[PDB]
Scaffold this active site. Structure first.
Site: not given
Ligand SMILES: [Mg+2]
Length: 553
Positions: A249, A254, A299
């Protein structure tokens, strides 16, 4: 038909505090709509013109709108700024000024929605050197044919100031009610498309069946699929039933990338169209993508000179450039790590299980300098994933994503099918006002510690939580030694201590609880480090805690 009916709706709506009725009204009026306006009407109902993901916007500010008004009115922007000074509401003054031209002006025609939409199109699309006047032209051009009712509404629409009282969900419910289609199907269909107009027309004509037959239009942006948090890697791996796909992550932004031919659009998390902001990336992607028709999720991250990711708000500023430009490309380099592919060449993959999706992703991507495929761990083993967790953290990203290998893409949904594993960030430095002895072999030591925060108003030291976790046995020894002199009182296994010692503590969550006089209670707190460089008065404060709790949503 007439913008009269629209103003009527805005009236009914304003009158009622009742959402169910607001639904009824919007609904009823929808049923009265001819198919031409079906794509136009909903946005109008929301008090907008185009979708949030449309690049078009009409440029018109208040003082600019002041002019277009005046030349319809005769009233100067001197008396208008006066005219709106009593009322408090722009459109309210605009409203009544038309009545003084209603003893006066000229000419022609009803205002019908068709016309108003057309004019708005012309207003937004108009550009360049000859721009802002041609706007105020068209606007006053509209205004002459306007009832003072309509005026106010067309005005707050233009300024974005509408106050219909009708959000997304009312409109969704409305469409469902009107056309007797299925709320789940409308939800699904708006989750794919994000175009309300398209959804409206499809409900009206092609009904429940065609709604179910709605798949991804390329260029029409998809609600990103969402993840709940996990506590931890084991929690996650076992919640996905012992095997799962793991990813980083990132600290990044995004994005969603739509490639058709040479036409390439990049939507933001909030579905801003950012495509213009980041042209390099656009080139990069065209190059990096094998298929001619694709949609990929990724991302976007800001690299910085040591190769470690910059906080992602840099990506957010990169988006926010409207202007002088290749300056920003050299200033902040970016790179794109793709984690998903929802579409290839007519094949909708949203309904396709995760693993093949990853397969298609690896297949369609030719990795470049700017364009990477997010690294993925497929494992049944915890310690592996925990190592990847520690590595993501090491590298300066946010944590680990866990995603179910059987998982279809669930647009908009916050599932247990993707999960996200983070630490909490900011740790608190607190003072130990108390403690509790160990049992068994630890019985000669204090095993649990009571922590409190300063209130410089009070001077009183207010308890926050009790931390038992994060100590070595020698930690407890050392801490016992030091807390030995400071103990002011005793009952049970509990002690009472002088506020000397400040420790740095991490927690999972802040809860509000009456059990402490601070009012807040640290959930699963843990020991990180000790501070001999600090004072009990210099420890973190309840105000800081309340602030953090309020920032916890
Ligand atoms: Mg964020």
């Amino acid at each position: 038909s007439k913008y009269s009916e629209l103003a009527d709706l805005y009236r009914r709506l304003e009158k009622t505090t009742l959402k169910t009725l607001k639904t009824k009204f919007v609904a009823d009026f929808l049923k009265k709509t001819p198919d031409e306006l079906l794509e136009v009407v909903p946005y109008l109902i929301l008090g907008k013109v185009f979708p949030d993901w449309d690049e078009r916007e009409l440029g018109v500010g208040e003082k600019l709108l002041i002019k277009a008004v005046s030349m319809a009115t005769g009233v100067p922007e001197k008396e208008i700024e006066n005219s709106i000074k009593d009322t408090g509401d722009l459109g309210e003054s605009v409203a009544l000024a038309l009545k003084k031209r209603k003893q006066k002006s000229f000419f022609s025609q009803p205002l019908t929605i068709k016309r108003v939409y057309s004019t708005f199109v012309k207003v937004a699309e108009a550009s360049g050197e000859g721009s802002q006047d041609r706007k105020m032209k068209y606007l006053a051009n509209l205004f002459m044919d306007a009832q003072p009712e309509e005026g106010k509404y067309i005005a707050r629409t233009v300024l974005g100031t509408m106050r219909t009282g009708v959000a997304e969900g009312i409109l969704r419910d409305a469409i469902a009610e009107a056309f007797r289609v299925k709320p789940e199907l409308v939800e699904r269909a708006y989750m794919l498309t994000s175009d309300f107009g398209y959804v409206a027309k499809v409900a009206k004509l092609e009904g429940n069946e065609g709604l179910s037959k709605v798949s991804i239009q390329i260029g029409k942006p998809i609600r990103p699929m969402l993840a709940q948090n996990a506590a931890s890697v084991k929690e996650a791996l076992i919640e996905m039933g012992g095997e799962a796909a793991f990813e980083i992550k990132y600290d990044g932004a995004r994005v969603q990338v739509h490639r058709d031919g040479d036409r390439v659009i990049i939507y933001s998390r909030r579905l801003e169209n950012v495509t213009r902001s980041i042209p390099e990336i656009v080139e990069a992607v065209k190059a990096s993508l094998k298929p001619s028709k694709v949609i990929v999720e990724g991302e976007l991250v800001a690299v910085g000179e040591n190769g470690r990711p910059r906080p992602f708000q840099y990506v957010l500023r990169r988006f926010r450039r409207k202007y002088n430009i290749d300056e920003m490309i050299e200033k902040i380099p970016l790179e794109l790590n793709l984690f998903d592919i929802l579409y290839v060449d007519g094949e909708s993959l949203i309904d396709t299980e995760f693993v093949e999706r990853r397969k298609r992703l690896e297949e369609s991507v030719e990795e470049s300098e700017k364009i990477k495929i997010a690294e993925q761990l497929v494992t049944k083993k915890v310690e592996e994933a925990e190592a990847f967790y520690k590595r993501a953290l090491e590298l300066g990203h946010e944590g680990l994503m866990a995603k179910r290998l059987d998982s279809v893409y669930e647009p908009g949904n916050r599932g247990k099918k993707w999960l996200k594993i983070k630490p909490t960030m900011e740790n608190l430095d607190l003072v130990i006002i108390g403690a509790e002895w160990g049992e068994g072999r630890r019985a000669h030591l204090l095993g649990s510690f009571l922590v409190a925060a300063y209130d410089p108003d009070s001077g009183e030291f207010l308890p926050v939580g009790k931390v038992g976790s994060g100590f070595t046995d020698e930690d407890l020894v050392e801490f016992t030694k030091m807390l030995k002199p400071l103990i002011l009182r005793e009952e049970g296994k509990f002690v009472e201590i002088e506020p000397k010692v400040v420790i740095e503590v991490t927690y999972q969550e802040i809860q509000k609880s009456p059990k402490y006089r601070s009012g807040f209670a640290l959930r699963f707190p843990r020991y990180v480090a000790l501070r001999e460089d600090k004072s009990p008065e210099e420890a973190d404060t309840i105000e800081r805690i309340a602030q953090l709790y309020e920032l916890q949503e």
